[PDB]
Coordinates of C-alpha atoms and ligand atoms in Angstrom, one line a residue:
Chain A
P1 CA 92.6 44.2 -52.7
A2 CA 93.8 47.5 -52.0
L3 CA 95.2 47.9 -54.7
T4 CA 92.4 49.6 -56.9
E5 CA 91.1 51.6 -54.6
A6 CA 93.9 53.9 -54.6
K7 CA 93.6 52.7 -58.2
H8 CA 90.2 55.0 -58.0
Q9 CA 91.0 57.5 -55.9
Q10 CA 94.6 58.1 -57.2
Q11 CA 92.2 58.8 -60.9
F12 CA 93.4 61.7 -63.1
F13 CA 89.5 61.8 -64.1
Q14 CA 86.3 62.6 -62.2
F15 CA 83.2 62.6 -62.9
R16 CA 79.9 64.3 -61.1
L17 CA 75.5 64.1 -62.5
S18 CA 73.1 66.3 -63.0
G19 CA 69.7 64.9 -64.9
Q20 CA 71.4 63.1 -67.6
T21 CA 74.7 65.4 -68.1
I22 CA 78.3 64.3 -67.0
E23 CA 80.3 66.8 -66.2
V24 CA 84.0 65.2 -66.3
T25 CA 87.2 67.2 -64.8
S26 CA 90.6 66.4 -66.4
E27 CA 93.1 66.2 -62.8
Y28 CA 96.5 66.3 -65.5
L29 CA 98.2 69.9 -65.5
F30 CA 99.8 68.8 -69.7
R31 CA 98.4 66.7 -71.5
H32 CA 94.6 67.0 -73.0
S33 CA 92.8 63.9 -73.0
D34 CA 93.6 62.4 -76.5
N35 CA 94.0 58.9 -76.2
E36 CA 90.8 58.3 -74.0
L37 CA 87.5 57.1 -74.6
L38 CA 84.1 57.5 -72.0
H39 CA 82.4 54.0 -72.3
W40 CA 78.7 54.1 -70.3
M41 CA 76.2 51.0 -69.5
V42 CA 73.2 51.4 -68.0
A43 CA 72.3 48.4 -65.9
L44 CA 68.7 47.5 -63.9
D45 CA 70.0 45.0 -61.0
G46 CA 72.9 43.7 -63.4
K47 CA 71.1 43.1 -66.6
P48 CA 72.5 45.7 -69.1
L49 CA 69.5 48.0 -71.0
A50 CA 71.8 51.1 -72.7
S51 CA 75.8 51.1 -73.9
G52 CA 77.7 52.9 -75.7
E53 CA 80.7 55.5 -75.8
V54 CA 81.4 59.4 -76.3
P55 CA 85.6 60.6 -77.3
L56 CA 87.0 62.6 -74.7
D57 CA 88.5 66.0 -75.9
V58 CA 88.8 67.2 -71.8
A59 CA 91.9 70.4 -71.7
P60 CA 94.3 70.1 -68.4
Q61 CA 92.6 71.2 -65.4
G62 CA 89.7 72.0 -67.8
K63 CA 86.0 70.2 -68.3
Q64 CA 83.3 68.3 -70.7
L65 CA 79.5 68.3 -71.1
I66 CA 78.2 64.6 -72.0
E67 CA 74.6 64.9 -71.8
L68 CA 73.4 61.2 -72.6
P69 CA 70.1 60.3 -75.1
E70 CA 67.0 59.4 -73.0
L71 CA 68.3 55.6 -71.4
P72 CA 65.1 53.5 -70.8
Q73 CA 62.6 53.9 -68.7
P74 CA 61.3 50.5 -67.4
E75 CA 58.2 50.2 -64.9
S76 CA 60.1 46.4 -63.4
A77 CA 61.0 46.7 -59.8
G78 CA 65.1 46.8 -59.4
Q79 CA 67.5 50.2 -59.2
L80 CA 69.2 51.1 -62.0
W81 CA 72.4 51.8 -62.3
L82 CA 75.2 54.2 -64.7
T83 CA 78.5 53.4 -64.4
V84 CA 81.5 55.0 -66.9
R85 CA 84.9 54.1 -67.5
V86 CA 87.2 56.2 -69.3
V87 CA 89.4 53.2 -71.7
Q88 CA 92.6 54.7 -73.8
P89 CA 91.9 52.3 -76.6
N90 CA 95.3 53.1 -77.5
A91 CA 98.8 51.2 -76.3
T92 CA 101.7 53.9 -74.6
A93 CA 104.8 51.5 -73.3
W94 CA 103.1 51.2 -70.1
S95 CA 99.6 49.8 -71.1
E96 CA 97.5 48.5 -73.0
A97 CA 94.9 49.3 -75.8
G98 CA 91.4 49.3 -73.6
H99 CA 93.0 49.8 -70.2
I100 CA 91.1 51.1 -67.9
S101 CA 92.3 54.0 -66.4
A102 CA 88.9 55.7 -64.4
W103 CA 85.4 55.1 -63.4
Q104 CA 82.6 56.0 -61.8
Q105 CA 79.2 54.8 -60.0
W106 CA 75.7 56.5 -59.8
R107 CA 71.5 55.1 -59.3
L108 CA 69.6 56.0 -61.2
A109 CA 66.1 55.7 -60.1
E110 CA 64.6 52.7 -58.4
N111 CA 61.4 51.7 -57.6
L112 CA 60.1 49.2 -54.9
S113 CA 58.1 46.3 -56.0
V114 CA 54.8 46.9 -55.1
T115 CA 53.5 42.9 -56.4
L116 CA 52.5 40.4 -53.8
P117 CA 53.9 37.4 -54.8
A118 CA 52.1 34.6 -55.9
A119 CA 50.3 32.9 -53.2
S120 CA 51.5 29.4 -52.9
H121 CA 49.4 26.2 -53.4
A122 CA 50.6 24.4 -50.2
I123 CA 51.4 24.6 -46.2
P124 CA 54.9 23.8 -44.6
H125 CA 54.1 21.6 -41.5
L126 CA 55.7 21.8 -38.1
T127 CA 56.3 17.7 -36.5
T128 CA 57.4 18.4 -32.8
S129 CA 59.6 16.4 -30.5
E130 CA 61.1 17.2 -27.3
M131 CA 65.0 17.7 -28.8
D132 CA 63.2 19.3 -32.5
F133 CA 61.2 21.3 -34.5
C134 CA 60.8 20.1 -37.7
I135 CA 59.3 21.8 -41.3
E136 CA 58.7 19.5 -44.2
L137 CA 57.6 21.0 -47.7
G138 CA 57.9 19.5 -50.2
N139 CA 61.1 17.1 -51.3
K140 CA 62.7 20.1 -48.5
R141 CA 62.7 19.4 -44.5
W142 CA 64.1 22.4 -41.8
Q143 CA 65.5 21.3 -37.9
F144 CA 65.6 23.7 -35.9
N145 CA 67.9 22.1 -32.4
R146 CA 65.6 22.8 -28.9
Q147 CA 68.2 22.8 -26.4
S148 CA 70.9 25.0 -29.0
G149 CA 68.0 27.2 -29.8
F150 CA 69.2 27.1 -34.3
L151 CA 68.7 25.1 -37.3
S152 CA 70.8 22.6 -36.8
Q153 CA 69.9 20.9 -40.5
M154 CA 68.6 20.9 -43.5
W155 CA 67.6 18.7 -46.3
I156 CA 66.3 18.7 -50.3
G157 CA 65.2 15.0 -50.7
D158 CA 67.5 13.2 -48.7
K159 CA 70.8 15.1 -48.8
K160 CA 71.7 17.0 -45.2
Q161 CA 73.0 20.9 -46.4
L162 CA 74.4 21.7 -43.2
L163 CA 77.6 21.0 -41.3
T164 CA 78.0 23.5 -38.8
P165 CA 74.9 24.9 -37.1
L166 CA 72.8 28.8 -38.5
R167 CA 74.9 30.1 -35.6
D168 CA 75.1 34.3 -34.9
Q169 CA 79.0 35.8 -34.7
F170 CA 80.4 39.1 -33.0
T171 CA 84.1 38.5 -34.4
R172 CA 86.0 38.2 -36.7
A173 CA 90.4 36.7 -37.3
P174 CA 91.9 39.4 -36.2
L175 CA 93.2 41.8 -39.1
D176 CA 96.9 42.7 -39.1
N177 CA 95.1 46.4 -38.4
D178 CA 93.3 44.5 -35.3
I179 CA 95.9 43.1 -33.3
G180 CA 98.9 46.1 -34.3
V181 CA 102.0 45.5 -32.2
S182 CA 100.3 43.2 -29.3
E183 CA 102.4 40.2 -29.3
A184 CA 101.4 36.8 -26.7
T185 CA 104.5 38.1 -24.8
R186 CA 104.1 42.1 -24.2
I187 CA 100.6 42.7 -24.4
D188 CA 98.3 46.3 -25.5
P189 CA 95.6 46.5 -24.0
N190 CA 94.5 49.3 -26.6
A191 CA 94.5 47.0 -30.1
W192 CA 91.0 46.2 -30.5
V193 CA 92.0 42.3 -31.3
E194 CA 92.6 42.8 -27.1
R195 CA 89.9 44.8 -26.5
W196 CA 87.5 41.7 -27.4
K197 CA 89.5 39.2 -26.1
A198 CA 89.5 40.8 -22.5
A199 CA 85.7 41.2 -23.1
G200 CA 85.2 37.5 -23.6
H201 CA 84.2 38.2 -27.5
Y202 CA 85.8 35.1 -28.9
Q203 CA 85.5 33.1 -25.7
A204 CA 81.3 34.7 -25.2
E205 CA 79.2 30.5 -25.4
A206 CA 75.3 31.1 -26.4
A207 CA 72.3 30.8 -23.1
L208 CA 69.1 30.0 -25.3
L209 CA 66.5 32.7 -24.3
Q210 CA 63.2 31.5 -25.7
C211 CA 62.5 28.8 -28.9
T212 CA 58.6 28.9 -29.9
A213 CA 56.9 27.2 -32.8
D214 CA 54.3 28.6 -34.2
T215 CA 51.8 27.5 -36.7
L216 CA 49.8 30.6 -39.4
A217 CA 47.3 30.0 -42.5
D218 CA 50.4 30.0 -44.7
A219 CA 53.3 29.2 -43.1
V220 CA 54.8 28.5 -39.5
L221 CA 57.1 30.7 -37.4
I222 CA 60.2 29.3 -34.7
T223 CA 61.1 32.2 -32.4
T224 CA 64.5 32.5 -30.8
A225 CA 66.1 34.2 -28.8
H226 CA 69.6 33.9 -27.4
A227 CA 72.5 35.2 -24.8
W228 CA 75.9 35.5 -24.8
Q229 CA 77.7 36.1 -21.3
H230 CA 81.1 36.3 -20.2
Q231 CA 81.3 35.3 -16.2
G232 CA 78.3 37.3 -15.5
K233 CA 77.8 39.5 -18.2
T234 CA 75.9 40.3 -20.9
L235 CA 77.3 41.5 -24.0
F236 CA 75.0 40.5 -26.6
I237 CA 71.0 39.2 -27.6
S238 CA 69.5 38.2 -30.4
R239 CA 66.0 38.0 -31.1
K240 CA 65.3 36.0 -34.2
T241 CA 62.4 34.5 -36.2
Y242 CA 62.5 32.0 -38.9
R243 CA 59.0 32.2 -41.5
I244 CA 59.1 29.3 -44.2
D245 CA 55.9 29.5 -46.5
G246 CA 54.5 27.6 -49.3
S247 CA 57.0 28.8 -51.1
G248 CA 59.4 26.9 -49.4
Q249 CA 61.4 30.8 -48.7
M250 CA 63.0 31.2 -45.1
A251 CA 62.5 34.4 -43.6
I252 CA 64.9 35.2 -41.2
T253 CA 64.4 38.7 -39.2
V254 CA 67.4 39.5 -37.0
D255 CA 67.1 42.1 -33.8
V256 CA 69.8 42.5 -32.2
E257 CA 71.3 44.0 -28.6
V258 CA 75.1 44.8 -27.8
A259 CA 76.2 46.4 -24.2
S260 CA 76.6 50.1 -24.7
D261 CA 80.4 49.0 -22.2
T262 CA 81.5 46.1 -24.1
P263 CA 84.3 47.4 -26.9
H264 CA 81.9 47.8 -30.5
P265 CA 81.5 43.8 -32.1
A266 CA 84.1 43.7 -35.0
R267 CA 80.9 41.8 -36.7
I268 CA 77.0 41.3 -36.2
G269 CA 75.8 38.2 -38.5
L270 CA 75.9 34.5 -39.2
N271 CA 77.7 32.3 -40.5
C272 CA 77.5 28.3 -41.0
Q273 CA 79.3 25.4 -43.0
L274 CA 77.3 24.4 -45.6
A275 CA 77.5 20.7 -47.3
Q276 CA 78.2 22.1 -51.1
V277 CA 81.6 22.9 -52.5
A278 CA 81.2 24.8 -55.9
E279 CA 83.0 25.9 -58.2
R280 CA 81.8 29.1 -58.5
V281 CA 80.2 32.2 -56.8
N282 CA 77.5 34.5 -57.6
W283 CA 76.5 37.9 -56.3
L284 CA 74.5 40.9 -57.6
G285 CA 76.2 44.2 -54.9
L286 CA 79.3 45.4 -54.2
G287 CA 82.8 43.9 -56.5
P288 CA 84.4 41.1 -57.8
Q289 CA 87.0 42.4 -55.8
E290 CA 87.9 42.4 -52.2
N291 CA 85.4 44.9 -50.6
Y292 CA 85.3 46.9 -47.2
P293 CA 82.8 49.2 -45.1
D294 CA 86.0 52.2 -45.2
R295 CA 87.2 50.9 -48.2
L296 CA 84.9 49.9 -51.7
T297 CA 84.5 53.3 -53.2
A298 CA 86.3 51.2 -56.3
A299 CA 83.5 47.9 -56.5
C300 CA 81.4 49.3 -58.4
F301 CA 77.7 47.5 -58.3
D302 CA 76.2 44.6 -60.6
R303 CA 76.5 41.0 -61.3
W304 CA 79.5 39.1 -60.8
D305 CA 79.9 36.0 -60.9
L306 CA 84.1 34.4 -59.5
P307 CA 85.5 31.4 -58.9
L308 CA 84.8 29.8 -55.1
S309 CA 89.1 30.5 -55.6
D310 CA 89.1 34.3 -56.0
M311 CA 86.4 34.9 -53.0
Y312 CA 90.0 34.8 -50.6
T313 CA 92.7 37.0 -50.0
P314 CA 96.2 34.7 -50.0
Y315 CA 97.1 37.6 -47.4
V316 CA 100.0 35.7 -45.8
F317 CA 99.5 35.9 -42.5
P318 CA 95.7 34.9 -42.6
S319 CA 93.6 37.1 -41.6
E320 CA 89.2 38.0 -42.1
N321 CA 89.2 37.7 -46.3
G322 CA 87.1 38.5 -49.0
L323 CA 84.3 40.3 -47.5
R324 CA 82.3 42.0 -50.1
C325 CA 79.8 44.8 -49.1
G326 CA 76.0 45.8 -49.7
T327 CA 75.1 42.3 -51.7
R328 CA 71.4 42.6 -52.2
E329 CA 71.0 38.0 -53.5
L330 CA 74.4 35.9 -52.7
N331 CA 74.1 32.5 -55.3
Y332 CA 76.5 29.5 -54.0
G333 CA 75.0 26.0 -55.5
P334 CA 71.3 25.0 -55.0
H335 CA 71.2 27.7 -52.3
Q336 CA 70.3 31.7 -53.0
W337 CA 70.1 34.4 -49.9
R338 CA 68.5 37.7 -50.5
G339 CA 68.8 41.2 -48.3
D340 CA 71.1 43.8 -47.9
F341 CA 74.1 42.6 -46.2
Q342 CA 77.6 41.6 -46.0
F343 CA 79.6 38.2 -47.0
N344 CA 82.1 36.1 -47.6
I345 CA 82.7 32.7 -48.5
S346 CA 85.5 29.8 -48.8
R347 CA 86.9 26.8 -47.3
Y348 CA 88.0 28.5 -44.6
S349 CA 86.8 29.2 -40.8
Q350 CA 87.4 32.8 -39.3
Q351 CA 88.7 29.4 -35.9
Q352 CA 91.1 28.1 -38.9
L353 CA 92.0 31.6 -40.0
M354 CA 92.5 33.0 -36.7
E355 CA 94.6 30.3 -34.9
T356 CA 96.6 29.7 -38.2
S357 CA 100.5 32.9 -39.0
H358 CA 101.1 31.4 -41.9
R359 CA 98.7 31.0 -45.9
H360 CA 100.7 28.3 -45.9
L361 CA 99.5 26.8 -43.2
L362 CA 95.8 26.1 -44.3
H363 CA 93.5 24.0 -45.4
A364 CA 90.6 23.6 -46.5
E365 CA 88.1 22.2 -44.5
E366 CA 84.8 19.8 -44.5
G367 CA 82.8 21.9 -46.7
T368 CA 82.2 25.7 -47.1
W369 CA 82.2 27.9 -44.6
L370 CA 79.6 30.9 -45.5
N371 CA 80.1 34.3 -42.7
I372 CA 76.4 36.6 -44.0
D373 CA 76.6 40.1 -41.4
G374 CA 74.5 43.5 -41.9
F375 CA 77.4 44.6 -40.2
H376 CA 80.8 45.4 -40.6
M377 CA 83.0 46.6 -38.5
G378 CA 85.7 49.2 -40.7
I379 CA 89.1 47.4 -41.3
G380 CA 91.0 51.4 -40.8
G381 CA 95.3 51.3 -41.7
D382 CA 95.4 54.9 -40.9
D383 CA 98.0 52.8 -39.7
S384 CA 99.1 49.1 -38.2
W385 CA 100.1 50.5 -34.6
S386 CA 97.0 52.2 -33.2
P387 CA 93.4 51.8 -33.3
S388 CA 92.8 53.0 -37.3
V389 CA 88.8 52.2 -37.5
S390 CA 87.5 55.5 -37.6
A391 CA 84.0 56.3 -35.9
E392 CA 81.1 56.4 -38.5
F393 CA 82.8 51.9 -39.3
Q394 CA 82.1 51.4 -36.1
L395 CA 80.5 49.3 -35.2
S396 CA 78.5 51.2 -32.0
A397 CA 74.8 51.4 -32.4
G398 CA 73.7 49.6 -29.6
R399 CA 70.1 47.0 -31.6
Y400 CA 71.0 46.2 -35.2
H401 CA 68.2 44.6 -36.8
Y402 CA 68.9 42.6 -40.4
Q403 CA 66.9 40.2 -43.2
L404 CA 67.8 37.5 -45.0
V405 CA 66.3 35.0 -47.0
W406 CA 67.6 31.2 -48.1
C407 CA 65.5 29.4 -50.0
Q408 CA 66.8 26.9 -52.6
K409 CA 67.0 26.3 -56.5
Chain B
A1 CA 47.5 54.7 -48.3
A2 CA 47.3 51.7 -50.5
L3 CA 47.2 49.1 -48.4
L4 CA 48.7 45.5 -49.9
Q5 CA 48.6 42.2 -47.0
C6 CA 46.0 42.2 -44.2
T7 CA 45.9 39.3 -42.1
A8 CA 45.2 37.7 -38.7
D9 CA 47.6 34.9 -37.2
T10 CA 46.9 33.5 -33.3
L11 CA 49.4 32.0 -31.4
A12 CA 49.7 30.2 -28.1
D13 CA 50.3 33.1 -26.9
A14 CA 49.9 36.3 -28.7
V15 CA 47.3 37.7 -32.0
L16 CA 49.5 38.4 -34.7
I17 CA 48.2 41.2 -37.4
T18 CA 50.7 42.1 -40.5
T19 CA 50.3 45.0 -42.8
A20 CA 52.0 46.7 -45.6
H21 CA 51.2 49.6 -47.3
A22 CA 52.6 51.8 -50.5
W23 CA 52.8 55.2 -50.2
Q24 CA 52.1 56.7 -54.1
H25 CA 52.2 59.8 -56.4
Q26 CA 51.4 60.0 -60.0
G27 CA 51.8 55.9 -60.3
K28 CA 55.1 56.6 -58.2
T29 CA 55.5 54.5 -54.8
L30 CA 57.7 56.7 -52.7
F31 CA 58.0 54.4 -49.6
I32 CA 56.4 51.1 -48.7
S33 CA 56.0 50.2 -44.6
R34 CA 55.1 46.0 -43.9
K35 CA 54.5 46.4 -40.2
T36 CA 54.1 43.4 -37.6
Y37 CA 51.2 44.2 -34.4
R38 CA 51.6 41.3 -31.9
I39 CA 49.3 41.3 -28.7
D40 CA 49.6 39.2 -26.5
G41 CA 48.8 37.8 -22.4
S42 CA 49.8 41.4 -21.0
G43 CA 47.6 43.8 -22.6
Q44 CA 50.6 44.9 -24.3
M45 CA 51.1 45.7 -28.5
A46 CA 54.3 44.9 -30.0
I47 CA 54.5 46.9 -32.9
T48 CA 57.6 46.2 -35.7
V49 CA 58.3 48.8 -38.4
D50 CA 59.8 48.1 -41.2
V51 CA 59.9 50.4 -44.5
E52 CA 61.4 51.2 -47.6
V53 CA 61.8 55.5 -49.1
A54 CA 62.8 55.8 -52.2
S55 CA 66.7 55.9 -53.7
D56 CA 65.5 58.9 -56.0
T57 CA 62.7 60.9 -53.9
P58 CA 63.7 63.9 -51.8
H59 CA 65.5 62.4 -48.4
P60 CA 61.9 62.3 -46.0
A61 CA 61.6 65.0 -42.8
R62 CA 60.1 61.3 -40.5
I63 CA 59.5 58.4 -40.0
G64 CA 57.2 56.9 -37.8
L65 CA 53.3 56.9 -36.8
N66 CA 51.1 59.9 -35.2
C67 CA 47.6 59.2 -34.0
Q68 CA 45.6 61.3 -32.4
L69 CA 44.2 60.5 -28.4
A70 CA 41.7 60.7 -26.6
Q71 CA 42.9 61.4 -23.4
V72 CA 44.5 65.3 -22.3
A73 CA 45.5 64.6 -19.5
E74 CA 48.6 67.5 -18.3
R75 CA 51.3 66.3 -16.9
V76 CA 54.0 63.9 -19.6
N77 CA 56.5 61.4 -18.6
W78 CA 59.7 60.7 -20.3
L79 CA 63.1 58.5 -20.5
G80 CA 65.2 60.2 -22.6
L81 CA 66.5 64.1 -24.3
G82 CA 65.4 67.1 -21.9
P83 CA 64.5 68.8 -20.4
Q84 CA 63.7 70.5 -23.2
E85 CA 63.0 70.5 -27.1
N86 CA 65.9 68.4 -28.6
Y87 CA 66.6 67.8 -33.1
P88 CA 69.3 65.6 -33.6
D89 CA 71.8 68.1 -35.4
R90 CA 70.8 70.0 -31.4
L91 CA 69.6 66.8 -28.9
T92 CA 74.6 67.9 -26.6
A93 CA 72.6 70.2 -24.2
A94 CA 69.9 67.9 -23.5
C95 CA 69.9 65.0 -20.8
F96 CA 69.0 61.8 -20.7
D97 CA 67.0 60.5 -17.1
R98 CA 63.0 60.6 -16.3
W99 CA 61.9 64.2 -17.6
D100 CA 57.9 65.3 -15.8
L101 CA 56.4 68.5 -17.6
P102 CA 53.1 70.0 -18.2
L103 CA 51.9 68.9 -21.9
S104 CA 52.0 73.0 -21.7
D105 CA 56.0 72.8 -22.0
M106 CA 55.8 69.4 -24.5
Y107 CA 56.0 72.2 -27.3
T108 CA 57.4 75.6 -28.2
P109 CA 55.5 79.3 -29.3
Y110 CA 57.2 80.2 -33.0
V111 CA 55.9 82.6 -33.5
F112 CA 55.6 80.5 -36.9
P113 CA 54.0 77.1 -35.9
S114 CA 56.6 74.6 -37.8
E115 CA 57.1 70.8 -36.0
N116 CA 58.3 71.4 -32.9
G117 CA 58.7 70.2 -29.8
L118 CA 60.6 66.8 -30.0
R119 CA 62.6 65.0 -27.4
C120 CA 65.0 62.4 -28.6
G121 CA 66.5 59.6 -28.1
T122 CA 63.6 58.1 -25.5
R123 CA 63.2 54.6 -24.5
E124 CA 60.0 55.3 -22.9
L125 CA 56.9 57.7 -22.5
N126 CA 54.1 57.7 -20.3
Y127 CA 51.1 60.0 -20.9
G128 CA 47.1 58.7 -19.5
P129 CA 47.1 55.4 -19.3
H130 CA 49.4 54.9 -21.6
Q131 CA 52.5 54.5 -21.9
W132 CA 55.3 53.7 -25.1
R133 CA 58.9 51.9 -24.1
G134 CA 61.9 51.2 -27.2
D135 CA 64.2 54.1 -29.0
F136 CA 61.8 56.4 -30.7
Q137 CA 61.9 61.2 -30.0
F138 CA 58.6 62.1 -30.0
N139 CA 56.5 65.5 -29.8
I140 CA 52.9 65.3 -27.9
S141 CA 50.5 69.0 -28.1
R142 CA 46.8 68.9 -29.3
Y143 CA 48.0 71.6 -32.4
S144 CA 48.5 68.3 -35.6
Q145 CA 50.8 68.8 -37.8
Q146 CA 48.2 69.9 -40.3
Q147 CA 46.8 72.9 -38.4
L148 CA 50.9 74.2 -37.5
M149 CA 51.9 73.7 -41.6
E150 CA 48.7 75.1 -42.5
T151 CA 48.8 78.6 -39.1
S152 CA 50.7 81.6 -39.9
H153 CA 50.9 83.4 -36.5
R154 CA 50.6 80.5 -33.6
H155 CA 48.0 83.1 -32.4
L156 CA 45.5 81.6 -34.6
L157 CA 46.7 77.8 -33.5
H158 CA 43.5 76.4 -31.6
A159 CA 43.4 73.2 -29.3
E160 CA 42.1 70.3 -31.0
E161 CA 39.5 67.3 -29.5
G162 CA 42.3 65.3 -27.1
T163 CA 46.1 64.9 -28.0
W164 CA 48.1 64.9 -31.2
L165 CA 51.5 61.7 -31.0
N166 CA 54.1 61.4 -33.9
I167 CA 56.4 58.8 -32.9
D168 CA 59.8 58.4 -34.8
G169 CA 62.3 55.8 -35.2
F170 CA 63.7 58.4 -37.6
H171 CA 63.4 62.4 -37.6
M172 CA 65.1 64.7 -40.1
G173 CA 68.7 67.4 -38.6
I174 CA 66.5 70.8 -38.5
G175 CA 69.4 72.6 -40.4
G176 CA 71.0 76.1 -39.3
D177 CA 74.2 77.5 -41.1
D178 CA 71.6 79.4 -42.8
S179 CA 67.8 79.6 -43.9
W180 CA 68.3 80.9 -47.5
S181 CA 69.7 77.3 -48.8
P182 CA 69.6 73.7 -47.4
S183 CA 71.8 73.4 -44.5
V184 CA 71.0 69.4 -42.7
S185 CA 74.4 68.2 -43.5
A186 CA 74.5 64.8 -44.6
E187 CA 74.4 62.9 -41.9
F188 CA 71.3 64.2 -40.6
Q189 CA 69.3 63.0 -43.7
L190 CA 66.9 60.2 -43.5
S191 CA 69.3 58.7 -46.9
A192 CA 70.5 54.7 -45.4
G193 CA 66.3 53.8 -48.2
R194 CA 65.7 50.7 -45.3
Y195 CA 64.8 51.9 -42.0
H196 CA 63.5 50.2 -38.9
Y197 CA 61.9 50.8 -35.3
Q198 CA 59.7 48.8 -33.0
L199 CA 57.4 49.7 -29.8
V200 CA 55.3 48.7 -27.0
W201 CA 52.3 50.5 -26.6
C202 CA 50.9 49.7 -22.8
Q203 CA 48.0 49.9 -20.2
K204 CA 48.7 51.6 -16.8
Ligands
LIG501 NA1 96.3 34.1 -38.1

């Protein structure tokens, strides 16, 4: 995946936008742009609106100005994105026709959605057992374990949807950059994986603080709190609210506290193993390739649709992989998640990736592991023998907030 | 402000008010604010605020609440950065501790009146019978942001009835590399798009 990031940063055409005018700059020192068009696409949350191509005639170290036509200006809700591609129409000795050599993206206009959703014809019903809070609406059932405090299972008809409960996750299968030169024999305490392991991040057990059900006029409200401890020290606290409304939508609100003096965690999100194994993964966000907070400049905001196999990156030493960032919608089988999040999705658990030394020893697990993070630590890589993740990409904030909506389709 | 949603619910141990406003100007929606007020058996009001800011409007000066209190107390007591005025890009000299000052010292008499007297990184603020807890920046004065904005000299300011309280989840840097061009650096601009902050309002 890193190659695209190299391609994007090393590109020979740099862009600036002012109003509807694009300043293209040439960083070539000897040749004109004698084999280059600029293609441009304007899109509203992935749906294309306007297109077009304009010839490029930039002297070496020169500038060309390009005025766009009066773009489409819809009242419909969403963010408008401009994307430009530089395309070589002709083959070279090193490339074939239609090769893309450079690109750049901008947000244009956003119109926030102000409409209230239409009132539902139905109210979701709460069923209280000693062991469970269960919620029914139509063909759909939700079950919350009152001993654990997690969503244990969801139903569409007789069909169960989960193999593992939906739980918080503050750890990732360590990257080569998290490990450095640390070895089982000779530990390096300065490596991120060792700081994490020493602090109990990987061995932290969840302790239920609160687990409460309430009925509202139009919804059921499940409210929970867990503390993750290691040998007496409280590392993380997660407070959630699950709000299931008449439309079959489950709004999850997460509010996490991280102890100031524990090593900054690798991620703040949820994960679960779903029962479904679908062939395609469709998301609105940065893509199409794998991208991380400190490696997402080559990625672009659009609708992407790839096979599940392409959402796993076969690094020979298995680690956390296949994350996409800045995602507003994710689709997998009947499931849809909405919000503002990072995700990865594969047949391989963070547990299996962490414990397996070679990609050829991995086995597909029963279902599909889904990690949804509100926040993810940078990957670093200025070197691979000392901590390389810059301060801006470490999760030091202390308090974190993220919101998901889980619904069916 | 245009009211979108205003609902009440009764829970086992508390009452929950949920609201949603849109701030508009000539057809353009600039901000949306979704809140939950949760008043529980202990007389404590827990307010959750979730704001959207349009990506193409200028990054706003602050994101918080404000009210005029009836109370005028003689002292202000807070746990956070102080004792002096401090802003996000000017708080290195400030130190985290419990600060107790006269309300006079919570206002900075700049000759040209502006926003002033903010303290940042505060977990607890105490004024008269009121306590607010959370993670916020505040200023507290007898002078509304409106009076300060409309007044050109400090000697023409008049104490209004009661006490104006600004509690911000987030507050833009003050800049100052020069004062004839924008000088607040990107990291101190409110460009995130979605913001969240949480207060609890208390009696003592
Ligand atoms: Na491994």
